[PDB]
Amino acid sequence: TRDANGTWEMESNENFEGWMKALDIDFALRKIAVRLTLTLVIDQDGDNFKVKCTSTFWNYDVDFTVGVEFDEYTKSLDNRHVKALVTWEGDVLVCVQKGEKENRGWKKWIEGDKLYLELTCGDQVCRQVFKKK
């Protein structure tokens, strides 16, 4: 449950629009993003991660080392500077992005061939479920 390697295909996506709105993403682009198929590609070696979420139009890419703070510029999302930090809380992978938005980050629970992802921003939570291909 601590191995997130793989290609992960979306099966569930709840409150995607509320989470994007909390990040101030443009209403027009939110309209397009809600239609796109999302694929999550994770390369994990020890504490080193490369995470890629891909669609037709926009990709989101981030590389990090567990336990090492990094400057993140969310250039393909809301275009903000955050201080990001990914850690293990038991078997949960937790990211906190310190910056303008409060309660901003994400959490991953890996349960066999299922991956549960919760994206948070302010009072909004987006809940996604993926299956390993």
Ligand X SMILES: *C/C=C(C)/C=C/C=C(C)/C=C/C1=C(C)CCCC1(C)C
Which residues contact ligand X by CB under 6 A?
33, 36, 38, 40, 51, 53, 55, 58-60, 77, 106, 108, 117
Nearer to ligand X, 46 or 60 (CB): 60
How near is the Cβ of 81 to ligand X at its closest, in Å? 15
Nearer to ligand X, 33 or 85 (CB): 33
Cα angle, residue 7 at apex, residues 66 and 26 outer, rounded to 5°: 80
How near is the Cβ of 23 to ligand X at its closest, in Å? 8
How would you list the strands of the sheet with 81-89, edge to edge? 59-65, 48-54, 39-45, 6-14, 124-132, 114-121, 105-111, 92-98, 81-89, 70-73
Nearer to ligand X, 102 or 116 (CB): 116
